[PDB]
């Protein structure tokens, strides 16, 4: 290439347009969220159905217990017809924030489980859970009323 | 489904979902066409997958021109394993291409070429004979 041709090619080079304000650093305009999700909607529906149907719920911390012992305790509860369900906290928070049980949001921290029942077998559930003294009864609800472990013991007695 | 037998522009998707893209110019012949068709028929299933040619029958092929296009209900990984081998067997540099990246690249290139903010352009200089630059310039380069 001749030097003049090289100079011409250098001068006719693409130069990018520079906006005054960077797109990343300017305020991001509000945008529509996802239209729908296959799993989150199902989880919300299941949570609503369980909350409406079951009258007694007990929210406790799910410790890293052995699977065999956990299944034995689940069978013991099923002998009294109590269902153990665990849902993601990142999905439970959105439902709990705007619902009847708004004050129970702080309960759902980390690995949590809910023992639910249509029949409030509180005494039987407490006697079954007393086998493992390290399992803490974080909270509960009976007839749409917020209650703690002491209140649950009072109701059982 | 199988490509029709071959005897002895076009850079955008029309029907298919994946394609074979060429990065350089080349020439294709009856032997190449027949070998590629045989390989595609051997590595394809007529029940679900369809393949379409885009080049004319015997052939000069330019850069970025799609020659073989693949469609059906399949993922990119299901077709890449064989389209990469077809691209390697092709007589020029070629690659298995996906629309989700090809269209994005084309749109970005068009946007850059439209948003170029250089006041002086090579076409402008060559046409206006500025600086007397056509003293050192090819006669075909005025349009080329």
């Amino acid at each position: 290439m001749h030097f003049q041709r090289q100079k011409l090619m250098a001068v006719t080079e693409y130069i990018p347009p520079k906006p005054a304000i960077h797109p990343s650093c300017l305020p991001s305009p509000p945008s529509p969220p996802q239209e729908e999700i296959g799993l989150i909607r199902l989880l919300r529906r299941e949570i609503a159905a369980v909350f409406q149907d079951n009258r007694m719920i007990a929210v406790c911390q799910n410790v890293a217990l052995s699977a065999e012992d956990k299944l034995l305790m689940r069978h013991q509860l099923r002998k009294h017809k109590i269902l153990m369900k665990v849902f993601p906290n990142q999905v439970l928070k959105p439902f709990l924030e705007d619902s009847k049980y708004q004050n129970l949001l702080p309960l759902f921290v980390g690995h949590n489980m809910l023992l639910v029942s249509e029949e409030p077998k509180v005494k039987e559930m407490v006697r079954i859970l007393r086998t493992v003294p390290f399992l803490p009864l974080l909270g509960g609800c009976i007839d749409d009323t917020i209650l703690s472990r002491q209140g649950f013991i009072n109701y059982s007695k | 489904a199988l490509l029709p037998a071959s005897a002895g522009a076009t850079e955008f998707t029309e029907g298919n979902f994946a394609i074979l893209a060429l990065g350089g110019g080349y020439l294709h012949w009856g032997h190449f066409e027949m070998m590629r068709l045989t390989i595609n028929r051997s590595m394809d299933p007529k029940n679900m997958f369809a393949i379409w040619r885009v080049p004319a029958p015997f052939t000069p092929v330019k850069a970025g021109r799609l020659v073989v296009e693949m469609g059906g209900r399949c993922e990119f990984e299901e077709v890449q394993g064989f389209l990469d081998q077809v691209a390697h067997k092709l007589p020029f540099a070629a690659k298995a291409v996906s629309r989700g990246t090809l269209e994005k690249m084309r749109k970005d290139q068009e946007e850059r070429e439209r948003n170029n903010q250089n006041p002086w352009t090579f076409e402008r200089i060559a046409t206006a004979n500025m600086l007397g630059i056509r003293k050192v310039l090819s006669p075909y380069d005025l349009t080329h």
């Binding site: 100079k7 011409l8 | 600086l131």
Partner: peptide, 29 residues
């Protein structure tokens, strides 16, 4: 030996192009 352009060479080319463009304008009336 490779050759490369510089900033002031760029400026000189651009100013000469501007002069020739002004000549183009004035040669149109």
């Amino acid at each position: 030996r490779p050759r490369f352009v510089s900033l002031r060479a760029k400026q000189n080319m651009i100013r000469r192009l501007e002069i020739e463009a002004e000549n183009h304008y004035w040669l149109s009336m």
